[PDB]
Ligand binder design. Structure first.
Ligand SMILES: N[C@@H](CCCC[NH3+])C(=O)O
Ligand SMILES: N[C@@H](CCCC[NH3+])C(=O)O
Ligand SMILES: N[C@@H](CCCC[NH3+])C(=O)O
Ligand SMILES: N[C@@H](CCCC[NH3+])C(=O)O
Ligand SMILES: C[C@@H](O)[C@H](N)C(=O)O
Ligand SMILES: C[C@@H](O)[C@H](N)C(=O)O
Ligand SMILES: C[C@@H](O)[C@H](N)C(=O)O
Ligand SMILES: C[C@@H](O)[C@H](N)C(=O)O
Lengths: 581, 585
């Protein structure tokens, strides 16, 4: 019944189109539904507005600017509601304080449209803002999506539909893999980790709000009546006080963790494949998998398991190891170590995507409370850290306070839902970071103060040092554009770290698989790694969350690796054929 | 100090121009002034918005329309206040409920969060809250009206309307190149000469200014010239409580010091009216109403009013000129004089009646419903005047006062101010006369109600004497004017209604022009009408109809002579700026 629909610019770019949506809305109502409609400004209309302002002053006072940009939807909802009224659909345009209030940023809807709900389709645009004071403003770039979800939440809508010039979410980038299939369903969490698959179609903060208030979502197309892609949430009631610019949505803590690491394994295709294949044959489910930058002609591989599986996991690992040695008698190779007294902590949040200083503030918070960071693993929306279990209590209190959030559960359908590829990034590693509190904080604070956002951070074992104090290598990734400046920022800071060094490698690609089904499902990572080895593709780095695995890989092989992952998990799906005679 | 400025679309059509006004505003502030600025949507930007709405519904719900149209105004004040800030002029954009509230007749009321922001900043405003709608505009001429209403509420020293025009001219330059730029014009004059301000300012706003004593100025943006000052009576200690912004009628008027002289069955040829009023003026007899409806055969009547105490003088003089208008001085059936002492003049007055249907009709219905018969009728641009039996005056005034929700206006003082301020011509009109309307209450009501229910707006209505007829029930001819486009439909509407009036008939004449002179100075100034009529006769121009208010005289005239008549009027009153002799080059 109660459905919130939103329509983007293009869907409304011409008067003709406006009449079409109006048609669908009517049809929807006549289905037995009540409709709240959010509309974006018409099209390049917004672009022309900003153009104009730019020829008047370089820096536009923000309020005068929010008023200017606010006129767009003001007209779009006027047009649409007229169009509805022409075809005898009772409608009405609500604006500003009639719909809600933004405070600065904190949004809160009301219900003069709960009223107007009787007969009419309520078409909405704008909230009232306070600081001077503005009568109508928008929430910004991705405001349309967010407003819609926030509204569905406030009204207890049955679901929320986002209409666009796209049938839904694909399994990957069609431009590289034509066999990319249209997803019927995807989880909020998956959608967040695969943000890029929704780049120009919907905004991560809105799918996160939907997840948090149990609002069913649907990415559909306007030029079609196809089902589209359902964005699915946990079944979750009334909450009103929405922070819309939070970098971090939640903090996480899992004490049921134990580390197995294989040290100094050969750095060649097939190694990781074999390791995890054998482990999965024991039906051993895995959590973290961390592999940072190579050390000479070899690397380490670390993973975590539930505490009571550590013994099993160590024994199995200890037995594969000799099969991993370049040559039988290489006792210096494939050496195994084990660590039982660890905890995993994380910060999670859609608001960290593309935003600087988030990881850095996590590290500072821990450093300020004296807790050393042992390992580090990023996904799209999580930064995970492994710490001494004894530090856990003060560590997550600190993170809880610093980020203003409550705790999500420690741990919460197919193994893989979609796969993705990033080839615009540069790897930068800082060799030999002293393994003591505050080091990562100081390196990543520096980058963040220069407005450089970081995409990946990977930190694994202590360096095999001849002598000096313990230290670890830290690898991270940034846009190739930021490569040079990043190096230039960090070089000073390591000047007097024994044997420290900065090395950049531009020729890398990142291949990722995402899937909620991989939790408590042994052999997912193994299948992924095997897929890359069968193509003789070397895995330079690995980083994980519970539902995302990323492998760093040679740039000249990113596409090949994407296709392999796509096929390994069957993203193209299955066609069928007339077998004759 | 406290100045409200308004800038129209064209003045703001381009970013470059926006920067220019911003410059002037800054200069104005540095002058030692506080500034409230009203701005219109950018250009044809608001037509553009309508082309879009139209495409969806040629019957656009007005609530949605107001919001829609409001957006062009919003972008403009944002731009302008940024432009001011770029040249270090503290400014700020106010909108909707921060400025005021419109309730829906439609009732506007400003506030003063800008009395506050007044400290340092030029406040640039757009929109009011509608009672709901968060931001809406007042409509087409809303910008002008908002500005004046604001100046009233803030006790502004004056209010300036900026536009792509130096001010108000004495007439239409397209017909009379020697048209001069007015330095000063009165609100009342500006109202009667509405057409001279057609595309530059809105009558409703000049009327608000007059009523709250707000000095006005029509100037140009591409210039620093003084412009045209629109002058009001000094009105002190009236507070702008609120404001009805869509009233058709501003006021009711009543004048009992009236007496009629009529010359009946005079020859219908050039020179007649000229001679009548010339001689009357030689006695220094000031005239009020002059009414001449449609011809009857080859002749017409001429009626005028005069103060009661002057009736005797006026009758005698008229009785003496008359024989000179005949075949032989002692001819019978020619130029006979009658006189009527027990009359009153009542009127409804209001800028809101310009171009709007049903107003005259509602006046006539109100009088009819209260049983009072209408004897004569005369329209100006903003007044419809009726002559009635003096005994009917009390019930007539009360009825009009109630029906239009206004109070009897007070008589005005005395002056002298030039006789004529400007002149104008309308040649897009058609004359339509309805012969032999039964002279009983409700007849005019029913004819004009019919036209108004079809959305036809009427420009002029003239009604004079009873028709000369042997036996039978008394009757008068009624002439009126409408846009030629409405000619046919008008005739078509009325034909049914007269089908059982003895000898009634409808006749249309499309080939007419209307020439008007306007001037506050013509009040208590004998010989103004005479000079006007003499001017047309000297050009051998026949006067088909005449209609009057205290400060406007209109003559209906043959269409192929409108321009000639306009030139004659402009020259007759030395509106060029001196006298002219055109000599051999
Ligand atoms: N971009 C964040 C970290 C996000 C990591 C997840 N991919 C920062 O620069 O602090
Ligand atoms: N639990 C899955 C995925 C582990 C890697 C991602 N957390 C497996 O055992 O392969
Ligand atoms: N009072 C002037 C003008 C009369 C026509 C307009 N009321 C006159 O006697 O000439
Ligand atoms: N236009 C009005 C009459 C106004 C008086 C004409 N100057 C109507 O049709 O009711
Ligand atoms: C280090 C190990 O993961 C190796 N690069 C592989 O591809 O298997
Ligand atoms: C992260 C690691 O290099 C170090 N132990 C730290 O806490 O900063
Ligand atoms: C009747 C009178 O108006 C005459 N037609 C004139 O022009 O003088
Ligand atoms: C002729 C017309 O004016 C009529 N006397 C009436 O009062 O309606």
């Amino acid at each position: 019944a109660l459905i919130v629909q939103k329509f983007g610019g293009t869907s409304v770019g011409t008067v003709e189109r406006i009449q079409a949506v109006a048609q669908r809305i009517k049809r929807t109502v006549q289905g037995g539904n009540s409709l709240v409609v959010v509309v974006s400004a018409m099209g390049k209309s917004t672009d022309v507005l900003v153009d104009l302002a730019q020829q008047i002053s370089p820096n536009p006072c923000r309020r005068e600017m929010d008023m200017l940009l606010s006129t767009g939807e003001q007209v779009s909802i006027a047009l649409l509601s007229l169009a509805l009224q022409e075809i005898d659909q009772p409608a009405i345009s609500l604006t500003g304080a009639q719909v809600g209030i933004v405070t600065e940023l904190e949004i809160r809807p009301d219900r003069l449209e709960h009223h107007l709900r009787e007969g009419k389709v309520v078409v909405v645009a704008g909230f009232q803002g306070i600081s001077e004071h503005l009568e109508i403003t928008t929430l910004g770039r991705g405001g349309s999506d967010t407003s819609a979800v926030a509204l569905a939440a406030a009204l207890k809508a049955d679901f929320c539909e986002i209409y666009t010039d796209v049938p839904g979410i694909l399994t990957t980038d069609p431009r590289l893999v034509p066999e990319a299939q249209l997803m019927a369903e995807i989880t909020c969490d998956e959608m967040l980790e695969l943000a890029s698959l929704g780049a120009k179609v919907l905004h991560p903060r809105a799918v996160e709000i939907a997840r948090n208030y149990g609002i069913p979502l649907v990415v559909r197309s306007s030029w079609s009546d196809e089902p589209g892609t359902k964005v699915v949430a946990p079944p979750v009631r009334s909450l009103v006080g929405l922070e819309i610019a939070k970098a971090v949505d939640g903090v996480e803590y899992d004490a049921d963790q134990a580390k197995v690491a294989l040290l100094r394994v050969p750095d060649r295709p097939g190694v990781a494949s074999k390791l995890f294949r054998d482990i999965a044959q024991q039906q051993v489910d895995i959590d973290l998998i961390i592999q940072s930058i190579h050390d000479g002609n070899s690397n380490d591989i670390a993973f975590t398991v539930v505490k009571d599986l550590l013994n099993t996991a160590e024994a199995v690992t200890s037995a594969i190891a000799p099969a991993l040695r370049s040559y039988p008698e290489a006792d210096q190779e494939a050496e195994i170590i084990v660590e039982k007294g660890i905890a995993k902590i994380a910060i999670a949040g859609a608001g960290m995507i593309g935003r600087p200083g988030i990881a850095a503030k996590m590290f500072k918070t821990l450093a300020d409370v004296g807790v050393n960071i042992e390992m580090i693993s990023t996904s799209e929306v999580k930064v995970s850290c492994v710490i001494d279990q004894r530090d856990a209590d003060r560590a997550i209190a600190a993170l809880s306070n610093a980020f203003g959030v409550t705790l999500s559960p420690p741990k919460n359908l197919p193994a893989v839902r979609g796969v993705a590829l990033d080839q615009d990034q540069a790897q930068i590693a800082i060799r030999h970071v002293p393994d003591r509190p505050g080091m990562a904080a100081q390196l990543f604070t520096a980058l963040a103060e220069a407005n450089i956002s970081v995409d990946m951070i990977i930190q694994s074992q202590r360096c095999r040092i001849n002598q000096g104090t313990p230290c670890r290598d830290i690898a991270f990734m940034v846009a190739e554009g930021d490569s040079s400046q990043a190096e230039a920022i960090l070089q000073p800071l390591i000047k007097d770290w024994l044997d420290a060094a900065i090395v950049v490698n531009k020729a890398i690609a990142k291949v990722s698989i995402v899937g909620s089904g991989m939790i408590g499902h042994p052999g997912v990572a193994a299948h992924f790694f095997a897929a890359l080895a069968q193509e003789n593709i070397n895995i330079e780095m690995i980083a994980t969350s519970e539902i995302k695995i990323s492998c760093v890989v040679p740039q000249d092989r990113g596409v090949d690796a994407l296709k392999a992952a796509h096929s390994a998990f069957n993203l193209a799906g299955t066609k069928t054929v007339t077998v004759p005679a």
